[PDB]
Write a protein that binds this DNA or RNA. Structure first.
Ligand SMILES: [Ca+2]
Ligand SMILES: [Ca+2]
Ligand SMILES: [Ca+2]
Length: 289
DNA sequence: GGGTTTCCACTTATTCATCCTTTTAG
DNA sequence: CCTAAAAGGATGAATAAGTGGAAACC
């Protein structure tokens, strides 16, 4: 079952990653051997996504990552041409576009067989230093000798894939002063590191609702785009993901979510039996699925 | 066959997703 | 008084990113 190209690119902005290995290999003619690719690592439950992606691109290999994870690794050099073609027609918009750029650059040096010369390896070290977490220091100990991205969401099918990765569909039960002492608050969320604060704010306007609650943890910091007004969730957010279908386990979470939303539309969230069903759906979704 | 590629097992730091309470708006 | 909306506290882990080893090619 193939994945829509834009949805895939959305799920890549969220879950994907590029890799450029520059390993010390004594059996190599320049002392170093390289490996270039693109990978996604999900929980074992979303293995069906990696397989669907594999059927869509016709490339990559799947192996386990520990007991609870599985990966899709596309390293076969000729298969890297599929990655580039796709991402050229359906580009990324996260700061990962800066990583994809460096990916193409490393691709060129190897397509010219330049990674087999002392300069090519030196050129790859230059490419890797600004890629993801940069060189491993020791590579700088052996080779001592940014540019932010700011695009906007291209369309909803992208948000679908991205929300399929970073998204959260929360039924928030609040201890309130109402008759039942429990207020039902549906919450839609998208979490992202503060490196893309622009894009996150872009969500407010692009969807016509929501806000950003600053998030932080000791040394780290990120953002959380949330939507709490039921009218926006019932009228603006739910329809977006009804036409632009989600993928993975998070779809079932989204469906259960809407079930509660129908009950909130019918005012059954105020009755006792309603609060039972809602509390029922909640316990069976997300980490309780 | 000697240099290179591709693969499969495996590791880890944090950025996520997840759950919750309190406070404010209407 | 009642319900909805927004703000914020807390954290384990599924991601992002990476590594060790060597069979598989060419
Ligand atoms: Ca991400
Ligand atoms: Ca995810
Ligand atoms: Ca998570």
């Amino acid at each position: 079952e193939s994945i829509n190209p834009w949805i895939l690119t959305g799920f890549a902005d969220a879950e994907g990653s590029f890799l450029l290995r520059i390993r010390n290999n004594n059996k190599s003619s320049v002392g170093y051997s390289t490996e270039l690719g693109f990978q996604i690592t999900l929980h074992n439950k979303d293995k069906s996504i990696l397989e669907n992606i594999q059927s869509t691109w016709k490339v990559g290999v799947i192996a386990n990552s520990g007991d609870n994870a599985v990966s899709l690794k596309v390293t076969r050099f000729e298969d890297l041409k599929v990655i580039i073609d796709h991402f050229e027609k359906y580009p990324l918009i996260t700061q990962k576009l800066g990583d994809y750029k460096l990916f193409k650059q490393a691709f060129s040096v190897m397509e010219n067989k330049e990674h087999l010369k002392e300069n090519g390896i030196k050129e790859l070290v230059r490419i890797k230093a600004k890629l993801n977490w940069g060189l491993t220091d020791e590579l700088k100990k052996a080779f001592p000798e940014r540019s932010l991205i700011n695009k906007n969401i291209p369309n909803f099918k992208w948000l679908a894939g991205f929300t399929s990765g970073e998204g959260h569909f929360a039924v928030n039960l609040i201890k309130s002063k109402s008759k039942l002492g429990v207020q039902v608050q549906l919450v839609f969320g998208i979490t992202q590191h503060i490196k893309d604060k622009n894009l996150m704010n872009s969500l407010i306007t692009y969807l016509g609702c929501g806000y950003i609650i600053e998030r932080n943890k000791s040394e780290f910091s990120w953002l959380d785009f949330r939507v709490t007004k039921f009218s926006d969730i019932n009228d603006k957010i739910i329809p977006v993901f009804q036409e632009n279908t989600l993928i993975g386990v998070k779809l079932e979470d989204f469906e259960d979510w809407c079930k509660v939303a129908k009950l909130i539309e019918e005012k059954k969230h105020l009755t006792e039996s309603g609060l039972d069903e809602i509390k029922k759906i909640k316990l069976n979704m997300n980490k309780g699925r």
